Amino acid sequence: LRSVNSREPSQVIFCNRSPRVVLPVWLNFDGEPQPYPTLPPGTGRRIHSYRGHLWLFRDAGTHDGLLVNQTELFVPSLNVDGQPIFANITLPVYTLKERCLQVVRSLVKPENYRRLDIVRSLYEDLEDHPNVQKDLERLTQE
């Protein structure tokens, strides 16, 4: 799951249509996620990248998954035929459960999450942070 090493510069632009600080993530020629500087919500930026490179977006504070042009993964396309390629970054409809872990994650130090009377099985779901390395291992199947 790598970017193809073209050297065909492609001008993209990351519009952040989300309440969250988004962290753009370029996935390397080898596979490893590299992170760029983040985007305050609303906020756009012009970006130089390359055809067939791969990106993905998430909360810079709680690695949650956002979408880019409605899919999971961004590949910059034909840099011209008009010029910049448009990268719109969105909340999905999180499920109510994941959302519910979010607020709780954001409300309690995960040291002190064992004193929160709910089924053990929900303690495990909650200590289970979203991870890019995970999600990659996830996405990598389809």
């Binding site: 909340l91 709780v104 009377d117």
Partner: protein
């Protein structure tokens, strides 16, 4: 068209089947009414809200906004969430 979902504190929530069948749990208790012995109303209202906020916004450009969860309600919501599978 519509289905009722009965809180454990009496309260009744008429919602559309289409919005309802979002809970894989509820898809099966229907198939009409559903009592919930252990979900108070202050929860079932947010749930119903989620079904409308889910049914509205999925499959769409129109910048999806944040579903807001009030702290007081988080745990109890979390537990209905998991039970209702959604």
């Amino acid at each position: 068209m519509y289905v009722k979902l009965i809180s454990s504190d009496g309260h009744e929530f008429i919602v559309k089947r289409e919005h309802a069948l979002t809970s894989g749990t509820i898809k099966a208790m229907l198939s009409n009414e559903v009592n919930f012995r252990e979900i108070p109303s202050h929860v079932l209202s947010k749930v119903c809200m989620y079904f409308t906020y889910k049914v509205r916004y999925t499959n769409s450009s129109t910048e999806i906004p944040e579903f807001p969860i009030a702290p007081e309600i988080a745990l109890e919501l979390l537990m209905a969430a998991n039970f209702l599978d959604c």
